[PDB]
């Protein structure tokens, strides 16, 4: 129940934290996936498709971190916490 968020406040932070134990885990959860997406884009030209690109279809020139957050919010990723 709220007006649609716009900018870097989308997706809403509470809905993201609903899926991760704590924000300190969420930051890594998003950063590692952003690195994976960036590596996939870098190797798009030629290379083994070991890193799978974005799951949710990206927008017109959307940053890898934003895509990572959006696909985290869509329940398409799984993470295991160290120690």
């Amino acid at each position: 129940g709220y007006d649609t968020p716009l900018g870097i406040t989308n997706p809403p932070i509470d809905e993201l934290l609903d899926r991760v134990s704590s924000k300190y885990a969420l930051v890594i959860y998003a950063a590692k996936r952003a690195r994976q997406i960036n590596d996939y884009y870098n190797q798009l030209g030629e290379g083994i498709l070991e890193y799978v690109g974005p799951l949710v279809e990206p927008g017109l020139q959307e940053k890898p971190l934003s895509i990572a957050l959006r696909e985290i919010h869509a329940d398409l990723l799984e993470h295991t916490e160290g120690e």
């Binding site: 799978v52 690109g53 799951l55 696909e71 398409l76 990723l77 799984e78």
Partner: peptide, 9 residues
């Protein structure tokens, strides 16, 4: 997740 990897390809 396995379902996402299957759906994408």
């Amino acid at each position: 997740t396995e379902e996402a990897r299957a759906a994408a390809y």
